[PDB]
A paper describes a structure:
Here, we reveal the extended and contracted atomic structures of an intact contractile-tailed phage (φCD508) that binds to and penetrates the protective S-layer of the Gram-positive human pathogen Clostridioides difficile. The virion can be divided into five distinct regions: the head, neck, tail, baseplate, and needle. Structures of purified φCD508 virions in both extended and contracted conformations were determined by single-particle EM of frozen-hydrated samples; the resolution ranged from 2.6 to 4.0 Å for the extended phage, and 2.9 to 4.2 Å for the contracted form.
At the base of the capsid sits a unique opening, centered on what would be a fivefold symmetry axis in a complete icosahedron; it is made up of 12 copies of portal protein gp45, forming an opening through which DNA is ejected from the capsid. Thus, there is a 5–12-fold symmetry mismatch between the capsid and the portal. (K) CryoEM density of C1 portal/capsid assembly showing the symmetry mismatch between gp48 capsid decoration trimers and the dodecameric portal assembly. Inset shows lacking density for the N-terminal arm of one portal-proximal gp48 protein.
Author numbering:
A (entry chain A): 44 to 143, 145 to 287
B (entry chain B): 13 to 43
C (entry chain X): 3 to 127
D (entry chain B): 93 to 143, 145 to 287
E (entry chain G): 16 to 127
């Protein structure tokens, strides 16, 4: 549907009390909880080109237009499914400071990553996916593995992080108006508990249909892309870090 | 239109018997 | 559910009848004690103390409003069938006099030769 | 009641049985563990946190070893540990041989066969909240398991349903009960902090 | 034929023009004090409970301690329980005293 529907379920509540010799037992209680609601939007772009431009221009073709459509589509998917994670206003409960001691090596981000794991678990969630920027890929990837021996201290590798994904910003200049998707800020990272609170909703993944043409101008069919998608992010899953 | 429900994960957490490694069980209805 | 994946909202369904209320737990004060199947007045509740209790212990009182065989009356008084019954907390004995005593029952079977009485228990007003 | 049964078609007795089982398991944990939690430990059974000076948080290792020294010097043996889920990660890090640090390798804590992470359990019934207070975060308990802890199982659990004399509007109410008893001790417990 | 028609655990009433009841709450309607099993509107039929049962409620005046054993009186003006013992109607006796959340367990009474 255009907008989904919340799940419903009932639950009983009771507590076992001490029942001394022949007394009356106190009954329980039933209650219901409901889920949230998610919705899916529509996106589309296209091109117009005269028949003469396609026929006379050697290099132009519908193949490059489809390539541009596919690239913008993939970038749109990344933006839709990762900008809720980035643009969210994280409370102090989620956020974790840099907490690097005096003059360490930059693999002292290991301190921050370990505590981010600790705070996820203390909050009963757990981090498995780490998101960051490529500006500190070498530092982070060195940090997940055990850093070299420093002053007689061989730190251990960080476990329970299945994969790390780096999402830099995407940019494109359509005509004279540039459109930019904000990536992960350098330094800041997001440790995520995956695919429990995050749901990807799809009705039509992508459909490049040839559009209406003005035959009176000999203009070719408007190649236009179209996807009907949506996302459902959350805050219970994610924990921010610094550096 | 068709009605579809967001199959989200809710419901109270399961509770486990954590005391067992400590206590020595004695089972008898005659007690 | 702490650490749940999703911010679900819990809605309570109200329920007034906590229990059947045929009996009531009560706590013994300093100057009170009980033994099984004996009538007592504890904290404004009158009933059959089904358990023994001496000092700050918990006991339960039957208030079923059923028929009860008691004895433990003021033997001098006559108890005809139908007469009201009052509990004299000072003497800890049943009596028909209504001077300052709690109304607790009505006799179903008159005082026999051994001072036994059957009576309905009343709703603890 | 009939009204509860007729409001929502999702309702059934199965959710009530599930709630009975859940509350029963929580009660078992409460009866068997809360003697350890709520005991008024004396100076003999209490060992204080001993963070020497700006140590990495696996300085809990030296606290646990001191707890073992307290049991062994007192001729107890703390084969089992109990702590909160909050301090769980640092416990396995402390239990295992902590990583090399400033040219000082601390050996693994061996005799602790297993560790029990017991948080509380809270339920809202009507307008009353009943909470079985689990292990307080920070504080931990070390136990000699079987010698001084006897569980008495006379009747594990039995649920029954009846409508012999109930109201017309009340469907057959469901009741569960269990005969059970537990014997705790102070001969076995040492109370750790952090 | 039998004089007894029902166990009397519940009694039906008809809401007046100044009365409206919601599910599982206490309401004094036509001299019957009980727990309404239906959400009722003006001139509608609802069913109350007079079961002489132990009942839970927090709809109390929070000014005085409801120590166990004290009689509970229902004040129809303010629509609250209280231990005033004034012209307000008598409805029950406290089984469990008030907690920090101001919740009361009390036994209903036979509407005399």
């Amino acid at each position: 549907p255009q907008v989904m529907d919340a799940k419903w379920a009932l639950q009983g509540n009771c507590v076992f009390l001490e029942h001394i010799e022949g007394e009356e037992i106190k009954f329980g209680t039933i209650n219901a909880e409901n889920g949230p609601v998610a919705r899916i939007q529509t996106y589309a772009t296209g091109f117009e080109y005269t028949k003469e431009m396609k026929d006379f221009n050697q290099t132009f073709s519908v193949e490059i237009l489809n390539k541009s459509i596919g690239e913008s589509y993939n970038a749109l998917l990344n933006h839709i499914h990762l900008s809720p994670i980035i643009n969210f206003n994280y409370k102090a409960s989620n956020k974790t400071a840099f907490k690097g001691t005096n003059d360490p090596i930059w693999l002292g981000i290991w301190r921050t990553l370990t505590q981010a794991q600790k705070d996820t678990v203390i909050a009963k969630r757990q981090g498995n996916i780490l998101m960051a920027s490529s500006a500190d890929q070498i530092e982070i990837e060195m940090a997940l593995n055990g850093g070299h021996l420093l002053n007689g201290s061989m730190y251990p590798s960080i476990k329970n992080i299945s994969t790390v994904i780096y999402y830099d910003g995407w940019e494109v200049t359509v005509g004279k108006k540039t459109y930019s998707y904000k990536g992960v800020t350098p330094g800041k990272g997001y440790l995520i508990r995956p695919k429990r609170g995050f749901k990807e909703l799809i009705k039509r993944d992508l459909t490049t249909e040839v559009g209406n043409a003005d035959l009176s101008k000999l203009v070719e069919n408007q190649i236009v892309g179209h996807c009907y998608r949506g996302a459902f992010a959350a805050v219970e899953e994610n924990v921010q870090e610094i550096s | 239109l068709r009605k579809v429900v967001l199959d989200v994960e809710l419901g109270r957490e399961q509770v486990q018997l954590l005391y067992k490694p400590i206590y020595d069980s004695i089972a008898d209805s005659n007690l | 559910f702490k650490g749940q994946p999703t911010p679900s909202t819990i809605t309570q369904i109200t329920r007034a009848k906590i229990s059947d209320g045929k009996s009531v737990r009560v706590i013994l004060s300093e100057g009170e004690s009980t033994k099984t199947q004996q009538f007592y007045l504890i904290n404004g509740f009158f009933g059959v103390a089904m358990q023994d209790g001496e000092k700050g212990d918990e006991v339960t009182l039957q208030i079923e409003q059923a028929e009860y065989e008691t004895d433990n009356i003021v033997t001098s008084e006559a108890f005809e069938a139908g007469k009201l019954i009052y509990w004299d907390n000072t003497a800890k004995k049943f009596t028909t006099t209504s001077a300052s005593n709690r109304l607790v029952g009505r006799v179903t079977d008159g005082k026999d030769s051994n001072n036994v009485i059957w009576f309905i228990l009343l709703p603890q007003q």
